[PDB]
Design a binder for this molecule. Structure first.
Ligand SMILES: Nc1ncnc2c1ncn2[C@@H]1O[C@H](COP(=O)(O)OP(=O)(O)OP(=O)(O)O)[C@@H](O)[C@H]1O
Ligand SMILES: [Mg+2]
Length: 858
DNA sequence: GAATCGAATCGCCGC
RNA sequence: UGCGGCGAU
DNA sequence: TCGATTC
């Protein structure tokens, strides 16, 4: 209802608390302490205003129950409501006479679905509708109950398997009106197939819809004291009305909770002084003692955070503190360019003036619908990044606090950060530059070639590309609005940032102070790291771990492999055959042709397979994708765009072409990156054995409990993997699904063990690289995006060294898979040792060759 | 045990 | 939390 | 397609 303002006492404290002010003043003066504390004050005040506007919107739209402030209320109210409507059924079944009107209607819908639909629509009508009458509420319940009753039988019974293909398309619909209108078309569709038993819904008359909710408000009042009954002008047969009113104690409960949440979600802005050095778990980054302190590790529970207060990880704490100390400044030159073209185009790069029938128009309709959502979503994030960039444009330097996710990858904390998109990366440059010199100018050109998309080509031709395009780079720097060439590039705003620094060198020579971050992006991190542990020679060569004759394109290597299978299958492949295929719901038994590998090879060679067909499949390998997931990928990535554009005529049956290509890609990656495939299988089997509760079937009691997965990275960071699942969840078709120590989810443990392990290794590599570049060399400024390592051009050659030396030091010292085995080997039940796979065999790779690989980049 | 389901992390915006 | 959309890796 | 979860 009426939320307290938290700012009058709580948000004033962060500016006036004298312990945080003094610790900030002692480091960077009292004046910068006053601006920084007032900025963190604005960050909390902006965050309270963000909550109050979203709360006001949910108030008008009746979605107050969807807000977090009403959730713990409804959690303690739902058991009492289900039991009253349950016990009322048993009473009416025992009472003689005719059943009440509502009794038959309340049965077809799930009883827990009654409880939520009544609670949500009561506070929807009591907060937005202004009509507090018992009839407008009770009817509004009854229409919402009939909607879940009528279209719920689609989800529940007569099409539960067929529900799985309409469920996604219903989720894409935005709005309860659009979700219902879509449900009307599917209902008419299945009834034409006789799927819902051939029984069409008889719509409830307006009298019963009120009678359903009237009993529902009564059962709400009988069970809980959420709403109280009121009668006005009693006895007057013309004015006798009944209204309902929210209990003031419960409206006070949501207002107190909403005020508490408003002071808890801030809008994290950059720092005008260097960030608070992390000494412990909390309170780092920002300097003030706020209501939400920054956690060093972003954990989903406060218990998983508490395990980090005992551990001694001095090398971990150093690397975040060094990465915090890197002073950035807003690139004013690209800010001048971005400020004008954003006023003319929605996206400044999206358009540039350069040189089965019914399912098709449905597919194009879903494309312009998603693209309409995509353009409005892309623009609002752009307008915020531009406002933050224009805000801190005049400051001599700004700083970003850093923490880490529960695996150890480091992330900046502020919303505007150097880990953003191409434009956000372009608006941000380092502040403390050095004279560029010969080596820095060389790497500045290599960075400019990478921004243009010329990264598949060895270094001398990258320099040649820049030198050939000298007059175009100079024209873009002199007049960026008159020469749109930089906008046509792959990373356009970061490329234009290079153009300004390139022109600055041609003007002021090699003594030019350049503070541009020069990012070195390692090729495929997970495969690089997986091939490093098990020492895969061919796998490392595929990801440029080895010094190669040229830049190795792993997608092109896999595309080369599938093309060799394609040519062999076009000759010696299987012919076509006719198989009987039955769809179980229809029950039909028809004959369809099954393309053999000879025919399917001829289709794909007619399409012409390149690195683009195999690209996304290789990239999602470290996330766990295998032969199934490739089949879905190549269907929507290459086959479906082909048939939409006029190609794909060779794909007579596209799912057979997808599954055939899926098989072919999987045989190719599995023999190209053998150490990647073997290591994720070893981690998956380890997490499977730990996530299982063992019990002898003749004993029953559990001999071993659900065990989590635990390891420590080589720089000392520990990580607990404990995916947990709730026990009860409920979903509604037209309304949001709401919930009703906890068990470990064995599937998510196995699904996530291999990506999180290799992500923890690359975060340890990024952490170790930051300290090695800072203590062996004099590097102070760091651009870090998990995969990419960037610094000023003068320090670029040394960061190029340090990112290589760390990986070969890490894997020469620690066998990360053998140390992983030493963690869980005690936790294994005696019946599981025979099933546990052995450690994969080490290969012929020399780690020292990484030190002389140009294209590892990292 | 036959039946049934599944096929990485982080942040922002909306419902 | 879930769902939709965007971005980063 | 194929083995873990889950009726
Ligand atoms: N590390 C990553 N993991 C998964 N997807 C990624 C990653 N980096 C980028 N993408 C996605 O890949 C697509 C763009 O591919 P991108 O150009 O970045 O690939 P690449 O590895 O540089 O290859 P190439 O230069 O051959 O195109 C986008 O959908 C982007 O979101
Ligand atoms: Mg690229």
């Amino acid at each position: 209802m009426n939320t307290i303002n938290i700012a009058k006492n709580d948000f004033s404290d962060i500016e006036l608390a004298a312990i945080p002010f003094n610790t900030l003043a002692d480091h960077y003066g009292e004046r910068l302490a006053r601006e920084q504390l007032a900025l963190e004050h604005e960050s909390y005040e902006m965050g309270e205003a963000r909550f109050r506007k979203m709360f006001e919107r949910q108030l008008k739209a009746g979605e107050v129950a969807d807000n977090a402030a009403a959730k713990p209320l409804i959690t303690t109210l739902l058991p009492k409501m289900i039991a009253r409507i349950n016990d009322w059924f048993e009473e009416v079944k025992a009472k003689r006479g005719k059943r009440p009107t509502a009794f038959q209607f309340l049965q077809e819908i799930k009883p827990e679905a009654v409880a939520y639909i009544t609670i949500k629509t009561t506070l929807a009508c009591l907060t937005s509708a202004d009509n507090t009458t018992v009839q407008a509420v009770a009817s509004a319940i009854g229409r919402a109950i009939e909607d879940e009753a009528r279209f719920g039988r689609i989800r529940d019974l007569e099409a539960k398997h067929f529900k799985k293909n309409v469920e996604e398309q219903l989720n894409k619909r935005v709005g309860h009106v659009y979700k219902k209108a879509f449900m009307q078309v599917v209902e008419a569709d299945m009834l034409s197939k006789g799927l819902l038993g051939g029984e069409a819904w008889s719509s409830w008359h307006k009298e019963d819809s009120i009678h359903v909710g009237v009993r529902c408000i009564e059962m709400l009042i009988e069970s809980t004291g959420m709403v109280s009954l009121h009668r006005q002008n009693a006895g007057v047969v013309g004015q006798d009305s009944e209204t309902i009113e929210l209990a003031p104690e419960y409206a006070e409960a949501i207002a107190t909770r909403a005020g508490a949440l408003a002071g808890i979600s801030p809008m994290f802005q950059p720092c005008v002084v260097p960030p608070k050095p992390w000494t412990g778990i909390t309170g780092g980054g920002y300097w003030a003692n706020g209501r939400r302190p920054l956690a060093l590790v972003r954990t989903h529970s406060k218990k998983a955070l508490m395990r980090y207060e005992d551990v001694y990880m001095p090398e971990v704490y150093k690397a975040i503190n060094i990465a915090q100390n890197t002073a950035w400044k807003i690139n004013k030159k690209v800010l001048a360019v971005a400020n004008v073209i954003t006023k003319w185009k929605h996206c400044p790069v999206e358009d540039i003036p350069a040189i089965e029938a019914l399912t098709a128009w449905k597919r194009a309709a879903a494309a312009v619908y998603r693209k309409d959502k995509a353009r409005k979503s892309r623009r609002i994030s752009l307008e915020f990044m531009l406002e933050q960039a224009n805000k801190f444009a005049n400051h001599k330097a700004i700083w970003f606090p850093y923490n880490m996710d529960w695996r150890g990858r480091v992330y900046a904390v502020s919303m505007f950060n150097p880990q953003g998109n191409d434009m956000t990366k372009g608006l941000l440059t380092l502040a403390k530059g050095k004279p560029i010199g010969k080596e820095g100018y060389y790497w500045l050109k290599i960075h400019g070639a990478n921004c243009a998309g010329v990264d598949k080509v060895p270094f001398p031709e990258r320099i040649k590309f820049i030198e050939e395009n000298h007059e175009n780079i100079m024209a873009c720097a002199k007049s960026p609005l008159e020469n749109t060439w930089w906008a046509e590039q792959d990373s356009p705003f970061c490329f234009l940032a290079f153009c300004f620094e390139y022109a600055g060198v041609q003007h002021h020579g090699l003594s030019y102070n350049c503070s541009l971050p020069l990012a070195f992006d390692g090729s495929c991190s997970g495969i690089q790291h997986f091939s490093a542990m098990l020492r895969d020679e061919v796998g490392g060569r595929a990801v440029n771990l080895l010094p190669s004759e040229t830049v190795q394109d792993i997608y092109g290597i896999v595309a080369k492999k599938v093309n060799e299978i394609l040519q062999a299958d076009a000759i010696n492949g299987t012919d076509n055959e006719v198989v009987t295929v039955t769809d179980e719901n229809t029950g039909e038994i028809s004959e369809k042709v099954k393309l053999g590998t000879k025919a399917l090879a001829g289709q794909w060679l007619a399409y012409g397979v390149t690195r683009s067909v195999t690209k996304r499949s290789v990239m999602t390998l470290a996330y766990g994708s295998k032969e199934f997931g490739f089949r879905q990928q190549v269907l929507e990535d290459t086959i479906q765009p082909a048939i939409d554009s006029g190609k794909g005529l060779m794909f007579t049956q596209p799912n057979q072409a997808a599954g055939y290509m899926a098989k072919l890609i999987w045989e190719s990656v599995s023999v190209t990156v053998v150490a990647a495939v073997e290591a994720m299988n070893w981690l998956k089997s380890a997490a499977k054995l730990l996530a299982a509760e063992v019990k002898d079937k003749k004993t029953g009691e559990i001999l071993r409990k659900r065990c989590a997965v635990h390891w420590v990275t080589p720089d000392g960071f520990p990580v607990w993997q404990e995916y947990k699942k709730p026990i009860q969840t409920r979903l509604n078709l037209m309304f949001l699904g709401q919930f009703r120590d906890s068990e470990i989810d064995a599937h998510k443990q196995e699904s996530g063990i291999a990506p999180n392990f290799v992500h923890s290794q690359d975060g340890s590599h990024l952490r170790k690289t930051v300290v090695w570049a800072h203590e062996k060399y004099g590097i102070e400024s760091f651009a870090l995006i998990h995969d990419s390592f960037g610094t000023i051009p003068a320090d670029a050659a040394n960061l190029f060294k340090a990112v290589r030396e760390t990986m070969v030091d890490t894997y020469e010292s620690c066998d990360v898979l053998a140390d992983f085995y030493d963690q869980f080997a005690d936790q294994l039940h005696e019946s599981q040792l025979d099933k546990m796979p052995a450690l994969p065999a080490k290969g012929n790779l020399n780690l020292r060759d990484i030190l002389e690989s140009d294209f590892a980049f990292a």
